[PDB]
Amino acid sequence: NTDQINKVPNDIVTRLVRESLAEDIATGDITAQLAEDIDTTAFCITREEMILCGQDFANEVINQLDKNIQITWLYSDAQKVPANARIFELKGNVRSILTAERTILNFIQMLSGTATVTNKLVKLISQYKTKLLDTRKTIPGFRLAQKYAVRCGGGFNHRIGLFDAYLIKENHIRSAGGIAKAVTKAKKLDSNKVVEVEVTNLDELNQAIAAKADIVMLDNFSGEDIDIAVSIARGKVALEVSGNIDRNSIVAIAKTGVDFISVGAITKHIKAIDLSLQVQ
Amino acid sequence: NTDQINKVPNDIVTRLVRESLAEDIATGDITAQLAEDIDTTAFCITREEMILCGQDFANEVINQLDKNIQITWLYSDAQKVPANARIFELKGNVRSILTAERTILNFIQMLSGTATVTNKLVKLISQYKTKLLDTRKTIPGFRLAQKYAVRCGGGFNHRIGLFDAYLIKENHIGIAKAVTKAKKLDSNKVVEVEVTNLDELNQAIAAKADIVMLDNFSGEDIDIAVSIARGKVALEVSGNIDRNSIVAIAKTGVDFISVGAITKHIKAIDLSLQVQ
Numbered sequence: 001n002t003d004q005i006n007k008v009p010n011d012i013v014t015r016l017v018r019e020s021l022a023e024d025i026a027t028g029d030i031t032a033q034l035a036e037d038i039d040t041t042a043f044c045i046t047r048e049e050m051i052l053c054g055q056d057f058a059n060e061v062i063n064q065l066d067k068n069i070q071i072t073w074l075y076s077d078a079q080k081v082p083a084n085a086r087i088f089e090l091k092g093n094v095r096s097i098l099t100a101e102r103t104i105l106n107f108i109q110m111l112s113g114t115a116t117v118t119n120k121l122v123k124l125i126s127q128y129k130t131k132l133l134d135t136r137k138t139i140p141g142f143r144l145a146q147k148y149a150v151r152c153g154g155g156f157n158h159r160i161g162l163f164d165a166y167l168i169k170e171n172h173i174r175s176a177g178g179i180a181k182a183v184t185k186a187k188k189l190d191s192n193k194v195v196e197v198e199v200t201n202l203d204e205l206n207q208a209i210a211a212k213a214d215i216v217m218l219d220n221f222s223g224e225d226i227d228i229a230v231s232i233a234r235g236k237v238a239l240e241v242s243g244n245i246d247r248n249s250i251v252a253i254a255k256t257g258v259d260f261i262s263v264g265a266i267t268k269h270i271k272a273i274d275l276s277l278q279v280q
Numbered sequence: 281n282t283d284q285i286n287k288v289p290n291d292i293v294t295r296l297v298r299e300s301l302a303e304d305i306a307t308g309d310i311t312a313q314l315a316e317d318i319d320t321t322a323f324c325i326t327r328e329e330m331i332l333c334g335q336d337f338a339n340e341v342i343n344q345l346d347k348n349i350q351i352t353w354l355y356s357d358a359q360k361v362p363a364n365a366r367i368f369e370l371k372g373n374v375r376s377i378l379t380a381e382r383t384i385l386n387f388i389q390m391l392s393g394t395a396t397v398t399n400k401l402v403k404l405i406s407q408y409k410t411k412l413l414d415t416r417k418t419i420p421g422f423r424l425a426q427k428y429a430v431r432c433g434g435g436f437n438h439r440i441g442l443f444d445a446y447l448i449k450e451n452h453i454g455i456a457k458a459v460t461k462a463k464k465l466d467s468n469k470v471v472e473v474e475v476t477n478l479d480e481l482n483q484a485i486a487a488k489a490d491i492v493m494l495d496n497f498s499g500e501d502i503d504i505a506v507s508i509a510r511g512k513v514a515l516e517v518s519g520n521i522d523r524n525s526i527v528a529i530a531k532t533g534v535d536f537i538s539v540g541a542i543t544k545h546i547k548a549i550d551l552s553l554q555v556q
Binding site for chain 2: 015017019020029031032034057094099103106136139141142161163167168171176271272280
């Protein structure tokens with residue numbers, strides 16, 4: 001069991017916003033200069049049902065552009081927002097608002113996208129005991145941001161990276177000897193770390209179990225083999241299933257009762273949520 | 281017409297790669313210590329047809345991790361890579377390679393994804409005079425990256441941001457005035473006006489706009505517009521367009537089609553790095 005990302009660190013939210021504003025704004029929003037320099041009002045809708053994620057970023061965009069803009073949130077991160085509902089309201093300067101706009105909803109679109117994908121898969125497997133794990137198949141620079149989205153949507157965090165946990169693969173098993181060696185060396189270095197071994201075989205699974213691993217990733221097992229594995233592993237090691245899984249394969253696998261299902265699809269791809277800022 | 285992005289500026293590539301390595305690596309890849317401190321070989325394969333994008337990022341990752349890794353590219357940025365073809369070959373240290381892998385893949389799968397979707401749409405409108413344009417609906421921090429992924433795929437760049445061209449939308453909008461004050465402030469920029477109807481289009485033409493964006497027109501009204509605008513202003517059609525509606529719009533003969541889908545969504549190409 002890994003650390004769960006239940007908030008993105010501020011310094012990471014800040015830097016990501018900063019760089020986002022720059023790439024878009026540079027010397028200045030030239031078209032905003034054509035708008036009356038006054039206060040007004042605005043609000044943001046979804047056009048579709050969604051799991052909100054991105055409050056912190058949107059907030060940070062406001063904060064960096066014009067602390068004068070007041071925001072009120074009608075929904076918070078990790079909530080199911082109904083299609084056509086207002087997520088937040090704005091009161092402030094027209095120019096600032098028109099400038100904040102695209103950046104703000106580019107963060108919500110994305111992260112709510114990620115959260116909403118996750119939630120789908122989760123509802124798909126809500127009847128089974130299985131849980132959803134994410135991966136490192138992330139958008140660069142958005143490792144933590146996406147771990148957070150996935151949590152926001154119902155999913156739990158597989159290891160954050162290469163440092164917090166051990167993941168022993170074919171490539172690793174091949175080198176410095178096989179499985180027993182690998183795990184043993186791995187405990188010797190740091191005994192506090194979770195040791196996971198990926199396998200392609202039931203035989204490799206027995207090894208990793210025999211070597212006293214903490215959890216075992218099943219790479220591309222047949223249904224039947226997953227069944228075998230579960231029997232073998234019950235009470236011994238935690239099991240996580242990997243095999244390019246999507247909304248169309250997850251249920252069959254979840255019916256097996258493996259503890260965990262790894263899914264890169266939930267971070268790898270993005271289905272952005274359709275948003276709109278209504279300014280007036 | 282607009283600035284086209286045929287290369288991502290070095291520092292952008294550097295800063296991106298640096299932060300993505302940091303976020304993955306931290307104090308260091310602990311699992312790599314189990315692997316032999318030996319030289320080996322590897323290759324990266326695509327498991328589907330695809331347009332390649334992200335060379336600069338893969339290279340730059342190598343450079344930050346271990347300049348002792350040798351890379352050979354069998355396909356370059358903006359080529360069509362066939363399913364199951366190798367993209368590049370590595371000769372180098374097992375540990376450095378195992379550690380570089382995911383960040384490397386994470387870049388190519390993303391940008392080639394963007395270039396690949398873009399290419400699909402282009403092929404769809406292949407038989408018409410219509411050209412594909414992008415938007416500002418990109419991934420935070422990947423503005424230039426994705427303008428480049430789009431160029432790589434056959435698409436063309438709409439303005440880069442809020443600084444390089446005018447875009448008079450409903451909120452700024454009357455029209456005549458707004459255009460006039462724009463050329464005052466800066467006669468040197470493209471003035472674009474987004475319209476919701478044919479009367480506004482008349483206004484924007486009458487005000488000598490550079491290009492005009494049609495927001496959610498019927499086919500019929502798009503037809504009319506085209507007729508009106510021939511030889512006057514360039515037309516661009518925005519209306520939440522996807523692979524399923526682009527052809528109908530292209531048949532109209534409008535100059536440009538605006539698609540946010542090509543960058544706001546991400547369909548990652550499937551990749552694998554076979555080490556050894």
